[PDB]
Curated annotation (Swiss-Prot):
<feature type="disulfide bond">
    <location>
        <begin position="98"/>
        <end position="144"/>
    </location>
</feature>
<keyword id="KW-0145">Chemotaxis</keyword>
<feature type="glycosylation site" description="N-linked (GlcNAc...) asparagine">
    <location>
        <position position="348"/>
    </location>
</feature>
<keyword id="KW-0325">Glycoprotein</keyword>
<keyword id="KW-1015">Disulfide bond</keyword>
<dbReference type="GO" id="GO:1900026">
    <property type="term" value="P:positive regulation of substrate adhesion-dependent cell spreading"/>
</dbReference>
<protein>
    <recommendedName>
        <fullName>Autotaxin</fullName>
        <ecNumber>3.1.4.39</ecNumber>
        <ecNumber>3.1.4.4</ecNumber>
    </recommendedName>
</protein>
<feature type="active site" description="Nucleophile">
    <location>
        <position position="159"/>
    </location>
</feature>
<dbReference type="InterPro" id="IPR044929">
    <property type="entry name" value="DNA/RNA_non-sp_Endonuclease_sf"/>
</dbReference>
<dbReference type="GO" id="GO:0006955">
    <property type="term" value="P:immune response"/>
</dbReference>
<keyword id="KW-0442">Lipid degradation</keyword>
<dbReference type="GO" id="GO:0047391">
    <property type="term" value="F:alkylglycerophosphoethanolamine phosphodiesterase activity"/>
</dbReference>
<dbReference type="InterPro" id="IPR036024">
    <property type="entry name" value="Somatomedin_B-like_dom_sf"/>
</dbReference>
<feature type="binding site">
    <location>
        <position position="691"/>
    </location>
    <ligand>
        <name>Ca(2+)</name>
    </ligand>
</feature>
<dbReference type="InterPro" id="IPR002591">
    <property type="entry name" value="Phosphodiest/P_Trfase"/>
</dbReference>
<feature type="binding site">
    <location>
        <position position="687"/>
    </location>
    <ligand>
        <name>Ca(2+)</name>
    </ligand>
</feature>
<dbReference type="InterPro" id="IPR001604">
    <property type="entry name" value="Endo_G_ENPP1-like_dom"/>
</dbReference>
């Protein structure tokens, strides 16, 4: 209930959200149907449109007009945005040359440059090039300011998860807005686009920028705009707020446009009808800039032009139906569309079984346009599992496709008439889902292109731009310092928590009762002296190129040196946390010799009590083992023995060994050929609770049968070379190039529908899907890499957030 016969007089677009018995006048009152009776009349004036004309210049102020062309309008802050152009001989901001903004040029009384976020729904990254001719204002921002070729959204590439990630710096799994539609089983409540539930505080986690600002003494304009407030009114409202007295004026503002998304759904990303919406967005940007210029704020404010996601061609005919796969389709509830999420229709159904649903949806048609996953098996780069609002069963849908439960759902009720031609929500590495970023203003750089980056990084930057300390978030603060002229954030490397042991030779062979054997008793003072040197670290500068990784948690581990590789060996997890090695362009690939096929050798630096054992692998009929440093890449027959040490061994399912062996035997050498040498760091990951963070030892749910050997959930590798590939990886002078992956350690290859074929036809496709940022690996292992390079730490943070996507341009 709202008593709506209070009044909006003097309260239009009030910044505080009034609770009853009061009528509301904020920019969201329409949405709650809570506005005062006079809201339209007072706050949504439209008389005489939005532009001055010569006849209005110097008019007698008339309060019914939408905007003013009277002499007093500048003092009042309510001139039409073209007032000075029409009445005072000024030029439109777009027709002005750009001039570097080296410092803020702000009116007296401004304590910091304001920030305006101009968010545009569905603005696909390639619009910047393909619509350039019809968007002169935006092209000016783009070329004069700082821009990226594209900005990566979070998954799912839907509006509410992405706008709220922009505001918080958090993954959807952490901020809790995991879709536009959601069921929370703890509340037993549903969040929907239409209706009241979505406004409940309990949905919205983390701390959004407007709250971060308010808590730290910085006033914020309201971020959300009701659909029926015309864009011109939104602009004039921001301009009016910017004219408030110093003690009332906000420092941060958001504009939001429902376009081009709205038309994109109807016409497809590049339908001919898409030109008009782009022109109209451009015109609104022009109105903002002309308006800022009139107020002498166009060289004071920082403007961010950002989208939430892109837009793909998707039509009705491209729908897969679960009714074609499941006999039990009525027993499940599907969140449908460009992703799928499945749960039981009834929690009282004891015959609902997720393993059999998954199996019925796996590789059933040769052209199948979705792939089912338990959520913990989704590519770790999606960060889409650690929330009870994310169903256990997920369907990753192919770009251009939809999934639905039954055909009736599509031509009846919500799935639009078969009139829709575009949609979005797909995997966030898909090119059509990429969106835009431009920053323009005194705090941003001038005419500068920066590489593509992820939207989770922007919250930190918007905090830097406003002088705020950001709440804890998933950005890597400093990784975007290269966008900024000033206000950079200068982080320090995290401190090492555990120092390593460097064990020497301390055990005799006969102390090991591990059930291992090796044909290695075949038999010199040059060669004996040299092996000792290698075990003391004589080749470490070749194989550990960027320093040892730092261990950021309390643990017990050993550094082990060898001819061809160095490793940090956990006495707690009984295997390396990391193994580091460098492979030059000209390296030779060799085989595992026949006599060494089943060879495992005790490591006389490491206690039997801290070692794995071969008997456990023999007893475990499901589990085998592989090696972190690959025997295939040994520098010599004698060096190859080191690769068979029990301290280089890791538990691997036979189905996983197909993957890992092909990577080690074929792909590492291919990358070294292509990149002029690579340095590889590989290791295990334990994430049994799918929270993206290193498990403690008491979180491990599976061990090799009979033993204390924990089974990794994933294996990672980080492959680093010189960005200037004319320099070899081990003698690189400048910036680095990296690609990494986090492969799931699975006991079958059901994820790969072509896996009955030779590894050359499916392994690399699997690895590409599981591409990762170094930073993802850091969270998952509690290690910090690249500690000793000659690069600026900010540049190394950028490198750590890089994702190799394997999409084309
Ligand atoms: C991405 O970045 C984010 C942000 O850094 C990382 O997210 C953080 O991850 C941490 C580790 O998982 C986690 O620490 C938790 O926190 C528990 C307390 O959490 C509540 O309070 C949080 C703080 O609020 C205040 O924050 C600011 C400044 O810091 C203040 O100014 C304000 O006053 C704020 O109020 C709050 O953010 C948090 O929000 C979550 O929960 C809400 C309700 O469920 C949601 O609305 C909201 O969306 C958040 O939801 C996410 O996080 C939860 C987990 O917290 C997750 O379940 C959801 O799915 C979703 O992912 C809360 O309201 C604290 O109780 C925990 O401590 C227990 O566990 C640890 C280790 O497991 C124990 O050592 C500790 O003793 C304690 O154990 C006890 O409890 C156990 C479990 O119940 C029990 O088994 C045991 O026996 C013991 O009794 C733990 O420290 C952060 O909360 C989390 N923050 C956010 C926003 O997500 C994230 O990891 C990054 N991701 C990656 C990949 O890097
Ligand atoms: O003004 C808005 O936000 C501004 C903003 C900016 C920034 Cl930087 C951060 C944040 Cl936290 C908020 N809101 C108003 C409009 C809402 C209704 N929507 C749909 O109805 C919709 C749209 C596009 C869609 N595509 N597919 N379904 C859709 C549903 C979107 C919603 C966006 C939220
Ligand atoms: Ca076995
Ligand atoms: Ca974990
Ligand atoms: Cl297999
Ligand atoms: Na398969
Ligand atoms: Zn959107
Ligand atoms: Zn949309």
């Amino acid at each position: 209930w709202t008593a709506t016969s209070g009044s909006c007089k003097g309260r239009c677009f009030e910044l505080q959200e009034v609770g009853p018995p009061d009528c509301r006048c904020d920019n969201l009152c329409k949405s709650y149907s809570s506005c005062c009776h006079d809201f339209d009349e007072l706050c949504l004036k439209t008389a005489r449109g939005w532009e001055c004309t010569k006849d209005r210049c110097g008019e007698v102020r008339n309060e019914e007009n939408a905007c003013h062309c009277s002499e007093d309008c500048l003092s009042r802050g309510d001139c039409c945005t073209n007032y000075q152009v029409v009445c005072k001989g000024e030029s439109h901001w777009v027709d002005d040359d750009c001039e570097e903004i080296k410092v803020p040029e702000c009116p007296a009384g401004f304590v910091r440059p304001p920030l305006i976020i101009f968010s545009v729904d569905g603005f696909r990254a390639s619009y910047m090039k393909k619509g350039s001719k019809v968007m002169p204002n935006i092209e000016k921002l783009r070329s004069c300011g700082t821009h990226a070729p594209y900005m990566r959204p979070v998954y799912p590439t839907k509006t509410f998860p992405n706008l709220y990630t922009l505001a918080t710096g958090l993954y959807p799994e952490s901020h809790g807005i995991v879709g536009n539609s959601m069921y929370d089983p703890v509340f037993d409540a549903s969040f929907h686009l239409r209706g009241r539930e979505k406004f409940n505080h309990r949905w919205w986690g983390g701390q959004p920028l407007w709250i971060t600002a308010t808590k730290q003494g910085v006033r914020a304009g309201t971020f959300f705009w009701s659909v029926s407030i015309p864009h011109e009114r939104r602009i004039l409202t921001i301009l009016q707020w910017l004219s408030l007295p110093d003690n009332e004026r906000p420092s941060v503002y958001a504009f939001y446009s429902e376009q081009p998304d709205f038309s994109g759904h109807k016409y497809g990303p590049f339908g001919p009808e898409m030109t008009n919406p782009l022109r109209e967005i451009d015109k609104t940007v022009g109105q903002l800039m002309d308006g800022l210029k009139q107020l002498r704020l166009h060289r004071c404010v920082n403007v961010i032009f950002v989208g939430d996601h892109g837009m793909e061609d998707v039509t009705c005919d491209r729908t897969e139906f679960l009714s074609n796969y499941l006999t039990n389709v009525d027993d499940i509830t599907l969140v449908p569309g460009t992703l799928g999420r499945i749960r039981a229709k009834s929690i009282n159904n004891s015959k609902y079984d997720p393993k059999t649903i998954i199996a019925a949806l796996t590789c059933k048609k040769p052209d199948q346009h979705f792939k089912p996953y338990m959520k913990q098996h989704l590519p770790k780069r999606l960060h889409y599992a650690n929330n009870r609002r994310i169903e256990d069963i997920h369907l990753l849908v192919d770009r251009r496709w939809h999934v639905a439960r039954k055909p009736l759902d599509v031509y009846k009720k919500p799935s639009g008439k078969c009139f829709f031609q575009g949609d979005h929500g797909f995997d966030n590495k898909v090119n059509s889902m990429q969106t835009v970023f431009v920053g323009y203003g005194p705090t941003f750089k001038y005419r500068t292109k920066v590489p593509p980056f992820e939207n989770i990084e922007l919250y930190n930057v918007m905090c830097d731009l406003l002088g705020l300390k950001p709440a804890p978030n998933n950005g890597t603060h400093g990784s975007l310092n290269h966008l900024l002229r000033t206000n950079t954030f200068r982080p320090t490397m995290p401190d090492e928590v555990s120092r390593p042991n460097y064990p020497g030779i301390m055990y005799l062979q006969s102390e090991f009762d591990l059930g291992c054997t090796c044909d290695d008793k075949v038999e010199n003072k040059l060669e004996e002296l040299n092996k000792r040197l290698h075990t003391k670290g004589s080749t470490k500068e070749r194989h550990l190129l960027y320093g040892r990784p730092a261990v950021l948690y309390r643990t017990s581990y050993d550094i082990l040196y060898h001819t061809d590789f160095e490793s940090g060996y956990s006495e707690i997890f009984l295997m390396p946390l990391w193994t580091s090695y460098t492979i030059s362009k000209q390296a030779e690939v060799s085989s595992i010799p026949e006599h060494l096929t089943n060879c495992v050798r005790p490591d006389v630096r490491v206690s039997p009590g801290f070692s794995q054992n071969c008997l456990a692998y023999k007893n475990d009929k499901q589990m085998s083992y592989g090696f972190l440093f690959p025997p295939y890449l040994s520098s010599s027959p004698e060096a190859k023995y080191d690769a068979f040490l029990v301290t280089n061994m890791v538990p691997m399912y036979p189905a996983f060994k197909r993957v890992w062996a092909y990577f080690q035997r074929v792909l590492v050498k291919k990358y070294a050929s292509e990149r002029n040498g690579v340095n590889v760091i590989s290791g295990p990951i334990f994430d049994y609770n799918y929270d993206g963070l290193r498990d403690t030892e008491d979180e491990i749910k599976q061990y090799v049968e009979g033993s204390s050997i924990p089974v990794p959930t994933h294996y990672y590798s980080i492959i680093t070379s010189c960005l200037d590939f004319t320099q070899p990886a081990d003698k690189c002078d400048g910036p680095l190039s990296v690609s990494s992956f986090i492969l799931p350690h699975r006991p079958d290859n059901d994820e790969s529908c072509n896996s009955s074929e030779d590894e050359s036809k499916w392994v690399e496709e699997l690895m590409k899907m599981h591409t990762a940022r170094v930073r993802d690996i850091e969270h998952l292992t509690g290690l910090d890499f690249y500690r000793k390079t000659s690069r600026s730490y900010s540049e190394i943070l950028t490198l750590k957030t890089y994702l190799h996507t394997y999409e084309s341009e």
